[PDB]
Every structure is written in C-alpha cells, then in structure tokens.
Amino acid sequence: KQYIISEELISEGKWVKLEKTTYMDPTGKTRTWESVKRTTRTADGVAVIPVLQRTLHYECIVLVKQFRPPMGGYCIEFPAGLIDDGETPEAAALRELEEETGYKGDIAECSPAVCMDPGLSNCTIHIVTVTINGDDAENARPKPKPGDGEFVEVISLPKNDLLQRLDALVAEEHLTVDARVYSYALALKHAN
Amino acid sequence: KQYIISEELISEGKWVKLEKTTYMDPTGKTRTWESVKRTTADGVAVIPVLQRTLHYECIVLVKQFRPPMGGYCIEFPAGLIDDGETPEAAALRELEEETGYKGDIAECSPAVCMDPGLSNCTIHIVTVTINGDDAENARPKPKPGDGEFVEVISLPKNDLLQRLDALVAEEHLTVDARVYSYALALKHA
Numbered sequence: 001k002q003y004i005i006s007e008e009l010i011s012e013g014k015w016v017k018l019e020k021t022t023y024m025d026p027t028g029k030t031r032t033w034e035s036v037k038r039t040t041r042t043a044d045g046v047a048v049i050p051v052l053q054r055t056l057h058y059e060c061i062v063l064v065k066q067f068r069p070p071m072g073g074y075c076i077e078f079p080a081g082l083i084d085d086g087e088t089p090e091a092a093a094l095r096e097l098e099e100e101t102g103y104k105g106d107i108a109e110c111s112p113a114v115c116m117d118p119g120l121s122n123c124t125i126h127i128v129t130v131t132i133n134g135d136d137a138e139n140a141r142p143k144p145k146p147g148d149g150e151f152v153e154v155i156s157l158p159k160n161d162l163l164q165r166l167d168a169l170v171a172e173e174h175l176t177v178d179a180r181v182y183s184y185a186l187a188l189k190h191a192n
Numbered sequence: 193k194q195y196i197i198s199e200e201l202i203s204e205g206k207w208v209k210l211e212k213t214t215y216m217d218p219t220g221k222t223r224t225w226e227s228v229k230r231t232t233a234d235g236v237a238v239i240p241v242l243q244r245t246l247h248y249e250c251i252v253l254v255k256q257f258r259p260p261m262g263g264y265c266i267e268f269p270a271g272l273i274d275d276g277e278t279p280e281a282a283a284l285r286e287l288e289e290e291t292g293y294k295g296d297i298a299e300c301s302p303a304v305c306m307d308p309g310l311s312n313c314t315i316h317i318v319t320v321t322i323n324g325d326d327a328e329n330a331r332p333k334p335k336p337g338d339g340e341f342v343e344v345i346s347l348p349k350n351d352l353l354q355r356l357d358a359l360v361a362e363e364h365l366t367v368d369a370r371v372y373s374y375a376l377a378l379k380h381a
C-alpha cells in the first residue's frame with residue numbers, strides 16, 4: 001500500500017543525480033523524498049568478504065584503506081566496486097579482489113542484492129564471501145593491479161580480534177571504518 | 193597524504209545536497225568527485241538483542257518502505273541523532289519508537305561510514321539488549337515519528353542468515369547490507 005507515484009529530476013551530475021520522489025504513504029496521503037540514483041540506469045556493485053586462510057595462523061579478513069572524497073578522509077572497507085558491463089557478481093568479486101588486493105580466491109557464498117543506504121539511494125550490492133588460500137604460491141606475493149587513479153593500501157586483520165583491531169585503528173590513525181565491516185566484526189563477537 | 197581542496201555546491205534540496213568535491217590525489221594530481229551531504233555523526237543503527245528466559249536470543253529488525261529504493265527494506269532500527277542528543281539516547285529512543293521495546297545499552301561503536309563512495313553519512317552502531325522478561329517488553333507498542341510506518345520482525349540470532357534468505361525468497365523486499373553482513377559473521381563465527 002506504499003508505492004512511488006512519480007520521480008522528478010532535481011540535478012544530474014556525471015555519475016549521480018538527485019530526485020524528488022513522490023510516493024503514497026499508508027494513510028493515502030502523498031509525500032516526497034529526496035533520493036539519489038546513478039546516471040547509468042542488476043545490483044550496482046559487489047563487496048568482497050575475503051577470508052585469508054593460512055595453516056598454523058589465525059584466519060584474516062582482508063580490508064582496503066582508501067581516501068574517500070565524500071568523507072574527506074581515509075576509510076577502511078571490504079574490497080568492493082562496480083560490476084562491469086554484463087559481468088556476473090561472483091566474477092566481479094574475484095576481479096575487484098585481485099585488482100584491489102592482489103589475492104586470488106574462491107567463492108564460498110553470494111548474497112542476494114542488498115541495499116547500501118536505502119534512506120538515501122537505491123544502491124544495491126552483492127556481498128560475496130571468498131576464501132583465499134594463503135598457502136598457495138599465487139597468494140605468496142600478491143600483486144595489486146589498481147586501475148587509473150585508484151590508490152589502495154591493503155590491511156589484513158586477524159578475524160579473532162577483528163573488532164578490537166578496528167577500534168584501535170580508529171583511536172590511533174583516525175580513519176573511518178565502514179559500517180558493513182563494523183557490523184561483521186560485531187557479529188563475530190555477538191555469536192558468543 | 194590526500195586531502196580535500198574544495199567543495200562547490202551543485203544542487204541544494206531541502207535535505208540533501210550534491211556537491212562537486214575537488215581533492216588532491218597522492219601523485220599530487222587534482223581530481224574531482226560527486227559527493228552527497230546534508231543541509232557528531234548523523235545517525236544511529238540499533239543492534240537489538242531480545243533476551244528471554246528459555247528462549248534463543250533474537251535480533252529485532254524493522255521493515256519499512258524506502259522511497260529511494262522503490263519498495264520495502266528489512267533494517268536495523270535506525271534514525272537521525274537530534275541536536276544535543278547522545279548516540280545511546282537516540283539509539284534507545286529510535287528502538288522504542290520503531291519497535292516498542294525498551295532496551296539497555298551494551299555498547300556503542302565509533303562513527304562508521306554508511307556509503308563512503310557517495311556520502312559523508314556516518315552513524316554509531318549501538319548494541320542494545322532487550323529484557324523480554326520485563327512486563328513492559330511483553331506487548332510492545334510502536335510509536336512512530338511523523339510519516340513513519342514500521343513492521344517488526346524478530347529472528348533468532350542462531351539462524352539469522354537462513355531466516356533472512358527465506359524472507360527474501362518469499363516476499364518482495366531487500367535486506368540491508370549491514371544486516372546481511374552481521375548475519376554472515378554470525379554464521380562464520
């Protein structure tokens with residue numbers, strides 16, 4: 001009993017547009033929302049949850065540090081990015097993971113499309129859990145191949161103390177942790 | 193190394209604005225980005241663990257219509273922090289408004305980013321326990337904000353990822369990425 005009635009363009013940039021969304025609320029009253037959408041009419045992207053498994057060591061979660069212009073600061077994130085021209089989620093996952101980290105991994109699982117920020121945008125991603133065989137030579141000396149203007153520092157953090165490692169990074173190096181990463185670190189503790 | 197050079201307004205809405213951000217890259221080249229912003233940390237998301245004697249713990253989630261998405265999304269209770277409000281007060285207030293439960297603080301994250309490729313939106317993630325043995329959390333009544341309409345869905349922590357998968361298979365609705373990320377780690381632990 002709620003639905004979109006109309007979308008009116010407010011402002012279109014190269015990558016991102018702002019829209020006045022009109023919609024019916026449940027009382028039968030009409031209401032507006034300001035909404036963001038891409039200029040490029042599938043989920044939009046993938047985030048990879050990369051579990052670096054090496055025997056006789058803790059499993060690690062591989063994260064990336066990048067400068068994020070909207071945040072005007074460095075942010076710690078799961079490797080992620082846009083699914084490219086008719087490409088599958090899984091394959092965008094391995095690719096992004098290689099481009100961003102150098103690791104070559106195997107799919108363990110793939111989420112349905114999930115919303116990034118539904119109070120603001122219609123951005124959806126697939127979250128893909130990937131195990132990295134860290135005892136295979138391909139992953140011995142992993143080589144990041146980042147595309148034009150992509151500057152990405154890898155940080156692998158033990159999965160055993162993930163939440164504590166994340167909080168320490170915020171307290172020390174004043175960077176921001178992504179909410180999906182934080183959510184995952186929390187649940188590792190909460191499963192107790 | 194890298195830093196913001198300038199922010200030039202493209203368009204101002206009542207609530208959100210689009211800006212052209214110019215930043216210094218690490219090679220020392222000037223670059224641009226399109227960034228969304230509002231007109232502390234903006235908000236809270238509540239992780240509500242319903243605890244009851246002789247029950248498995250539940251995670252309390254809300255279903256709401258999300259205009260940006262064109263349909264209904266399953267979320268952690270979440271809302272903006274009012275001026276002068278603490279994250280924890282907001283968390284508890286939003287939880288009660290959205291679900292009817294009165295919770296107790298367990299923990300509060302640092303500010304974390306929602307969508308850093310797009311906005312500077314940050315939240316605190318606030319873990320709250322709900323004493324479901326207490327008489328006030330027996331028949332909880334939502335008291336939603338102005339133009340706010342919520343259904344409550346409580347799922348066992350010990351089965352969250354599977355129960356979310358079911359809901360997505362049976363209904364026409366999206367799970368939020370933070371919810372789905374939490375359900376995954378539960379299974380991975």
Ligand SMILES: C=CC(=O)N1CCC[C@H](n2nc(-c3ccc(Oc4ccccc4)cc3)c3c(N)ncnc32)C1
Pocket residue numbers: 015016036037038044082121122123124147148149224225226227309310
């Ligand atoms: C060469 C490579 C490259 O630079 N790329 C790769 C190709 C273009 C990328 N891009 N595109 C974005 C962007 C797009 C989508 C975003 O979320 C969504 C929003 C609404 C609905 C769905 C998703 C967020 C951000 C972003 C920007 N706001 N400004 C500047 N450019 C950046 C960057």
Ligand SMILES: C=CC(=O)N1CCC[C@H](n2nc(-c3ccc(Oc4ccccc4)cc3)c3c(N)ncnc32)C1
Pocket residue numbers: 032033034035119120207208228229230234272311312313314337338339340
């Ligand atoms: C129930 C409550 C209520 O009705 N309110 C009263 C209070 C105002 C609320 N509001 N505001 C928003 C909004 C603001 C910012 C958003 O993201 C960002 C947050 C921080 C930094 C960057 C981005 C997303 C959404 C939203 C809208 N985009 N359209 C229309 N109004 C809605 C509406």
Ligand SMILES: [Mg+2]
Pocket residue numbers: 079080081082096100
């Ligand atoms: Mg990326």
Ligand SMILES: [Mg+2]
Pocket residue numbers: 080081096099100150
């Ligand atoms: Mg990438």
Ligand SMILES: [Mg+2]
Pocket residue numbers: 269270271290
């Ligand atoms: Mg809310």
Ligand SMILES: [Mg+2]
Pocket residue numbers: 270271286289290337340
């Ligand atoms: Mg609310």
